[PDB]
Amino acid sequence: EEEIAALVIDNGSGMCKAGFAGDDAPRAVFPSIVGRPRHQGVMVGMGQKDSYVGDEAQSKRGILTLKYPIEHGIVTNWDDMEKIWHHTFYNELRVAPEEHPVLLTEAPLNPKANREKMTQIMFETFNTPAMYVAIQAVLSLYASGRTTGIVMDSGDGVTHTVPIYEGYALPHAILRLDLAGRDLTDYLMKILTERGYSFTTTAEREIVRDIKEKLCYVALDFEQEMATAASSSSLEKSYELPDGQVITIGNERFRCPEALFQPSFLGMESCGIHETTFNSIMKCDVDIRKDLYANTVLSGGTTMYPGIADRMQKEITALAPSTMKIKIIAPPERKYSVWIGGSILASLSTFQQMWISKQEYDESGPSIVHRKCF
Amino acid sequence: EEEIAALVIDNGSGMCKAGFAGDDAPRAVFPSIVGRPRHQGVMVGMGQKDSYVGDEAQSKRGILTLKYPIEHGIVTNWDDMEKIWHHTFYNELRVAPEEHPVLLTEAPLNPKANREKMTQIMFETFNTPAMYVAIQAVLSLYASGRTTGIVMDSGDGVTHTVPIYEGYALPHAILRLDLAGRDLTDYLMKILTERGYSFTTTAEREIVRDIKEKLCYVALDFEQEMATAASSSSLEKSYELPDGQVITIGNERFRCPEALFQPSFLGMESCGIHETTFNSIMKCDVDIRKDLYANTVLSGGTTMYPGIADRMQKEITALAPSTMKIKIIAPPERKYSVWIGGSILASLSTFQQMWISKQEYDESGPSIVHRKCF
Amino acid sequence: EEEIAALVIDNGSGMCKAGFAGDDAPRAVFPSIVGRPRHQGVMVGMGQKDSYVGDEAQSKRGILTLKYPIEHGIVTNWDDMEKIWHHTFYNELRVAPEEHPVLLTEAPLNPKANREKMTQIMFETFNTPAMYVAIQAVLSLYASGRTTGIVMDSGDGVTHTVPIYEGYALPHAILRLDLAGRDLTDYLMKILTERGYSFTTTAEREIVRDIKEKLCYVALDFEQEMATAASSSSLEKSYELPDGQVITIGNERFRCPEALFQPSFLGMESCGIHETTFNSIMKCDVDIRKDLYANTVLSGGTTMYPGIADRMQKEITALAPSTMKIKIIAPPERKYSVWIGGSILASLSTFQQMWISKQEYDESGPSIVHRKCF
Ligand SMILES: Nc1ncnc2c1ncn2[C@@H]1O[C@H](COP(=O)(O)OP(=O)(O)O)[C@@H](O)[C@H]1O
Ligand SMILES: Nc1ncnc2c1ncn2[C@@H]1O[C@H](COP(=O)(O)OP(=O)(O)O)[C@@H](O)[C@H]1O
Ligand SMILES: Nc1ncnc2c1ncn2[C@@H]1O[C@H](COP(=O)(O)OP(=O)(O)O)[C@@H](O)[C@H]1O
Ligand SMILES: [Mg+2]
Ligand SMILES: [Mg+2]
Ligand SMILES: [Mg+2]
Structure with a gap:
């Protein structure tokens, strides 16, 4: 096949959103949970199945104790994460990761260890030709089809805020709120x-x-x-x-x-979140602010609540200069914005050279994550 | 022979239900009674026969005083129980227990001594290669061919209640009503x-x-x-x-x-029994209740009365949320459910490794009953 | 008289501990039980006495069925509670509540209805000039004479945990364990x-x-x-x-x-309780933890068991940084700590203005409990 497709996975805490790059929606979306049988079973010809992963766990909830392996964008327990990924590839997608480059999302300001260790897994667990680890907010901005904006990213994991102008990106300005x-x-x-x-x-x-x-x-x-x-x-x-x-x-x-x-x-x-948005914008250069006030993009599951956009609008407008109009662009289908962004990125031709190649990793080690990608 | 067959005995008070594992009904079912000649006989060439056991006693009732050896799932008198077992093996089944692994039933929440002493007998009275002692309710659940349910077990001995979900089992939830x-x-x-x-x-x-x-x-x-x-x-x-x-x-x-x-x-x-069923269900996790309300299984002799199912249905439905439908599954042939369950369990291949082996007992002692089995 | 005295009552489930504010021990402490004659009596010139309350019930136990009116810090049955209070005032203390302000204890995180309804009773059952409803843990902290600590409060009702620093109090940090x-x-x-x-x-x-x-x-x-x-x-x-x-x-x-x-x-x-204590402390600001590790106060009846303090010490020390020493302060007389705390609070002069006044209630209604007090 041409281009080989590519695989995309969004793991903020709570949900794994996975599917083929080059499609408008992910195939599989299920809760990132590893339930374990807390109560000792007494029959014969059960399971045994040491633990359950994904919406399986939701189905058989009462028996299990559930452990979310990711907290605050940090993976607490790695074997659990590996199990979740295992489940995504084999149980849902039915792909050999050897046959696809895989994109992972990851939150800003997040510990190095997570990116590094993440890559370590992808290469030395699921043998894979190439991979990339990408910032959540940027992806959603792509998904929205805008070049500029301040992306308010709040998942189940943690909330994040990354102002972007004309592409580019402002490290000092990026904010992460627990x-x-x-x-x-x-x-x-x-x-x-x-x-x-x-x-x-x-x-x-x-x-x-x-x-x-x-x-x-x-x-x-x-x-x-x-x-x-x-x-x-x-x-x-x-x-x-x-x-x-x-x-x-x-x-x-x-x-x-x-x-x-x-x-x-x-x-x-x-x-509060609105004040954090101001904290971000105020950190940015005086020139660009005008469009950031006007281009605020909301993403992630925990922006879904009805009426959030309106409240953010009222608060930001109240705080800011009323000299400039404060549009907030919050699409429905925002929940999946990160994953969509991933799809579009792996679909991009030029991106196909920026992958972290298996080869490169083998020579240079796991530390190369930061060297190459943002 | 292959698999050697296996032997199964249900002793809740009142009846011994025994037969070969691997059959749909037990061969022998008789009352667990040891009658003794209370009146001094005067003839010559009587008996003498110090006592009578099983339906023999029923036949010659007037002379004897009958003593049920089991009360409330507890064996009052051990020699009597041994005599009853003697009668089952030699008088009815005509088996050498050395040639068969034997499964015993036993009630929940029951004193340790009964299980331990039970095993002590089976090894050091009727020499036997292996044995197991199993909870009555579970067996009936198997017999019903359902993986989940709250089994209301009332024999002549005592009444018991064990909620089970997807196999598993909830110790705290198990209820025993005198x-x-x-x-x-x-x-x-x-x-x-x-x-x-x-x-x-x-x-x-x-x-x-x-x-x-x-x-x-x-x-x-x-x-x-x-x-x-x-x-x-x-x-x-x-x-x-x-x-x-x-x-x-x-x-x-x-x-x-x-x-x-x-x-x-x-x-x-x-x-009352219906309230005890609620007591059990209410002790269980909120998630599973839906199916326990719908999967209540009745077992044991003293559920045989006509119209019990209906009354339980009316009472439970009355007490519970009418949001969910409360099916009660009470088969006819419920009386023998425990024994059938035993048959199916010993017939299971994997079960054949879970036996308590004679060898294991000889090394580790009688106390090992609890260690291994539930 | 000057100051009028004041009355104090601790009702976590199980025991009513009541007496005059301004004394080091309560006068009356008896079990909070309402026993009812389940068996129909046949004599003449009995009772009849529809029910018995307090250690009366303990004395005549066999006949009665006992019902604890409070479960898990929640009052199941109000008339019963009213009866218990009736018994405290008239049967033991021999006071007209019109002549005394009354302090009640109550557990944290507890339903609003209980506080509100509690106050409704005190005003519109036992006419009383003023009253207050106070958190159990704080009271014990006062009784211990320390300004800072994490009070582990476990009665018969429920277990509770409230970290306090220099007075103050951390709502998010408060933990309640069933x-x-x-x-x-x-x-x-x-x-x-x-x-x-x-x-x-x-x-x-x-x-x-x-x-x-x-x-x-x-x-x-x-x-x-x-x-x-x-x-x-x-x-x-x-x-x-x-x-x-x-x-x-x-x-x-x-x-x-x-x-x-x-x-x-x-x-x-x-x-477990020790882990819940860690759950509380970990919720608190990094700065104060040092003294919370060192100032853990145990209160309530179900901390009385010999050796609890030591086990908590060993477990907390094991879990925590051994960089800082973990003293646990568990006085004997801990059982009565809540009531003592109540005594000291009503004794305080300034407190005498914080009472919920009868007048204030009459104007503003029962809902004012939350408005004024914690
Ligand atoms: N329809 C909804 N309405 C409101 N809140 C929601 C909705 N769906 C999910 N959430 C909240 O958002 C969280 C899911 O966030 P998610 O997008 O999975 O984060 P991430 O992409 O970082 O994993 C849920 O745990 C829930 O708290
Ligand atoms: N046909 C029947 N109808 C109603 N009640 C019965 C019937 N048969 C037995 N019983 C009652 O149930 C008891 C038998 O219970 P059983 O199943 O032997 O208990 P276990 O299995 O624990 O020994 C009898 O003693 C009797 O009280
Ligand atoms: N001497 C004791 N030793 C051990 N446990 C006790 C002792 N006294 C009481 N308890 C336990 O603690 C409970 C009493 O708690 P209590 O202080 O009355 O709670 P509250 O103050 O919330 O009503 C009893 O029900 C009992 O379980
Ligand atoms: Mg997200
Ligand atoms: Mg039975
Ligand atoms: Mg208390």
Whole structure:
């Protein structure tokens, strides 16, 4: 075949988004979880299967304890990650990685060890001709088809912010904020408890993740919505648990995402996301700011909440000079923006020379990740 | 011969159900009773036969006092149990236990001594190559051919409840309730007495056991049926005693099994069986409950009463979320479910390595029962 | 009189600890139980007394079914709670609550409804000039006379953990773990059953509570002590039941409290108490940790077991940096620490302005509990 295709994998914590480069959507997207049988089984002709990976784990949740192998964009446990990759290639895609160059995503400001060790695996686990490790935000910017913008990237892992002008990139300006979908989930299960509902375990932690993925939304003004919580009508929603129990969540709903804008709720000093955006933009040269204010791109799973764009618009506009208009461009299909970006990058002809080649690695070692790529 | 066959014995109190592993029904099933001649005989060329075991005792009832060696899943008297086993092997099956591995059933949450001592006997009474001691409920679940369910196990011994999901098993969730066929019998003979019929002795205690085994049934609503007892037509049934006397039992019939649902009748606080099932399910992880509500399996002799399934369905459905449908799967042939399960387990190839070997016992002692098996 | 005194009540589940503010020990401490006569009485000139409350119930146990009105720091049944409070004021203290401000304790992370409804009762049941509802852990920290520490609060209700530095308090850091004296009791009666002793009923459930309150102790290494259980000498203890029966409990003794450190025994994933303490400390700012490691305060009834402090010390030290010394401060009289703390708080002069006044409630409603107090 010509070009051999290429493979793309986005691993921020939470989800593996994988598929062939050269396609508009990934084939496989599943949760990055390694569940292990915590309870000793007593039958015969079970499994045994030491552990389960991917949406298999979601299916058989109750038995397993789940461990997310990636936290805050850092891989805690490598064998687990390897298992997840194993699952992606063999279980879903059904590819021999020897037959494809593979692109991996990775978060900014992230420890060296992760990139280096990542590469070490890809070469000396799944024998592969070539690979690349790329910054998440840039990819989403490509996916949006814009050359310039400040990409607000918040996955389940961690939140990141990378201003880009006319390509280029500003290292000093790049900001990384420790908040995530996962932190919101932890906050949320906390906030439910005041209502009586107690979710103590990893299994049901994912149930609240599911709740947040639909029921939660961001207030266009927090205090107003909280005021209107007095007369509860629309702000309460019934949710059905898999157990059959019913949950009814009012104001607690929208204050969950509020945390992004008020990390004091969580107890961290680190400024809210909008202020971090200003922190990024203010670090940039005076000249370019005009378009960065106007070209803010949101990416990653934890920007999905309804009404986030609007709130960011209102806050940034409030803070900034009203001399210039602040457009925020947040596409739907943002969740997959990183992966799409990866697809487009590996599809690019010129890119086909920038790969880290197996050969190059074998001569020069794993450390070469930083030398070559950003 | 290949595989040597294998032997299976179910001893919950009341009945010994024994036969060859690898068959769909046991060969021998007889009552676990050791009758002794209480009255001194005066002839010559009698017996003498110090005691009788199995349905022999049923045949010659009047003379003997019967002693059930097992109470509440605990063996009261070991020599008696040994005698019963003796009878099963030599009198019915006609096997040398040296030539067969033997599987025993045993109830959950049961004292260690019973398992340990049980094994001690099997090795150092009937010389046998290998053996295993297995939980009653699991076996019935196998017999039903389902991988998941909450098995409500009530024999004559005691009632037990073990939720199982996808194999696995939840120790904390396992529940053991002190009610049984035998307690119902004791209640029943009590309740007859208000009608005039007085059954004071072990002999006729078994007569009432027989009555209960057919005449008694469970109300689909207790109070309604008791109300309709005013106009007695169908609720009375003539029963013929072996004496030739006739008994006529009305409302007293169905309130006997009612006890399972209203242990206050018996005077115990311990919740009714349906509530215990909820107690089990509620102890389990939120995720799996959906299928446990739907996969409840009834086993054991004292689930045989007509209409039990229906009442359990109505009560559980009443208590639970009506969001999810509560199927109860109660096969006919449930009585023998444990034994069938044993047959299927010993028939399994892989199981053939999990046996407790004579050799292993000789090195490691009797205590190894818990170490190896559940 | 000057200052009017003030009243203090600690209701975590299990015990009501009540007395006058301004004294070093509470006057009345009795079990929070509402026993009801389950069996219909037949005499004349009995009671009748629909139910019994407090150590009255302990005295007349056999007849009654006992219901603990509080579970997991949540009041299940309000009328019952009201009855218990009734009993405290009228039966023991002999006070008119109109003549005293009353302080109540309450557990962290606890449902709003409990605080709100609690206040609703105190104002519209026992007419009272003022009241306050306070966090259990803080109170014990006061009682210990230290300004800083991480208070591990485990009653019979639930276990809680609140780090405090120089006063202040860290909401995000506060941890609440579902384990308790009551869960240990449930585990313990389970574990006895393997020995033959079967305790099926609420009455004798309290007998095992009593056993645990003395016989049980925590291993300074679990596996070592369990190993030494082979040669049983000191690890067995005879206990006398009220029935006159004697119980003999070996290794089963110490593995009961082991559960706090290995909740897998109970079947919960939730980490052990020491790990939860680390979970709390790790949530806190890097700066303060040094003194939290050094100032851990244990409170509540279910820290009473001999050897708990030592085990916590060994585990925390093992996990933490050995760069800094980990003192654990666990006073004897810890059981009463919450109540003492309450006494000292109501004694404080300035506190006398922070009360929730009857007047304030009447204008502003019950919801004001959260508004004013923590
Ligand atoms: N539909 C949704 N609405 C709101 N939040 C969502 C939704 N889907 C996912 N999330 C949140 O975003 C997270 C997924 O982020 P993801 O894009 O997988 O990050 P990454 O690409 O870095 O792995 C989830 O864990 C969840 O908290
Ligand atoms: N046909 C029947 N109808 C109703 N109840 C029955 C019937 N047969 C047996 N029982 C009750 O169930 C008991 C038998 O239980 P069994 O299955 O032998 O328990 P186990 O398997 O634990 O020994 C009897 O003692 C009797 O009380
Ligand atoms: N002397 C003791 N030794 C060991 N455990 C005890 C002792 N006394 C009480 N306990 C355990 O602690 C519990 C009492 O906790 P308590 O302090 O009343 O909690 P709270 O203050 O939240 O009500 C009892 O139920 C028992 O399990
Ligand atoms: Mg991402
Ligand atoms: Mg049985
Ligand atoms: Mg307490």
